Amino acid sequence: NPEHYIKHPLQNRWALWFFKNDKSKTWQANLRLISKFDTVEDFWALYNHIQLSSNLMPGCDYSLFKDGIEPMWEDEKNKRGGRWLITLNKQQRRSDLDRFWLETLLCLIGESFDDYSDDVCGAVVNVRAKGDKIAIWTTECENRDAVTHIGRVYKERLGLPPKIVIGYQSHADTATKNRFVV
Numbered sequence: 001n002p003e004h005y006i007k008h009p010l011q012n013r014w015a016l017w018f019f020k021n022d023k024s025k026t027w028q029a030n031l032r033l034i035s036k037f038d039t040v041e042d043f044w045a046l047y048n049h050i051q052l053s054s055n056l057m058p059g060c061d062y063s064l065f066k067d068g069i070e071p072m073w074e075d076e077k078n079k080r081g082g083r084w085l086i087t088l089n090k091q092q093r094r095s096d097l098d099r100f101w102l103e104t105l106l107c108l109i110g111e112s113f114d115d116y117s118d119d120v121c122g123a124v125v126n127v128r129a130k131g132d133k134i135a136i137w138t139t140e141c142e143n144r145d146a147v148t149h150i151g152r153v154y155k156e157r158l159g160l161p162p163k164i165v166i167g168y169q170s171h172a173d174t175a176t177k178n179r180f181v182v
């Protein structure tokens with residue numbers, strides 16, 4: 001009866017990355033791999049071991065990307081893509097940041113975007129003095145059906161009401177100008 005002793009595999013292997021602003025180093029040299037995991041049990045062991053995003057120093061990021069996709073725009077799977085952006089005010093660091101980030105992680109490892117989960121590359125949380133940000137990165141900013149389905153599902157999974165609109169920008173523009181809004 002394998003259910004007793006086998007870990008539950010995830011559809012993908014995922015890499016969790018950490019960034020801290022150290023002005024002595026280049027941006028790339030500051031982007032650091034925490035660990036990779038590919039089971040439910042190993043995801044929770046990692047998550048239960050690390051700091052909540054709300055406890056990070058301003059200027060730090062977490063990011064979760066599929067194994068083989070670097071957490072930067074210049075990766076082959078990111079360079080033609082873009083992101084759904086959640087912007088948090090300073091009060092939402094207390095109320096929403098950690099629960100929104102956990103839900104984002106689960107949307108990813110749980111493959112919650114049906115046939116379009118293959119367009120997801122990863123997700124990033126930025127802790128910043130002027131307002132935190134959470135974003136889901138996807139591979140192709142011209143795939144309207146993929147991008148808007150991901151945005152509608154994501155908005156629903158976060159519990160955001162229709163009074164809130166979220167935008168999708170291509171990375172080529174980021175490097176707010178929206179391609180899509182939901």
Ligand SMILES: *S(=O)(=O)c1cccc(S(=O)(=O)N(Cc2ccncc2)c2ccc3cc[nH]c(=O)c3c2)c1
Binds near residue numbers: 017019071
């Ligand atoms: S926010 O904090 O104001 C902000 C502004 C600009 C970019 C970003 S970012 O795209 O989320 N970003 C941080 C990051 C951290 C860890 N993993 C991925 C992304 C970021 C910053 C600088 C970059 C330089 C070059 N290529 C990139 O893809 C970069 C991404 C947040």
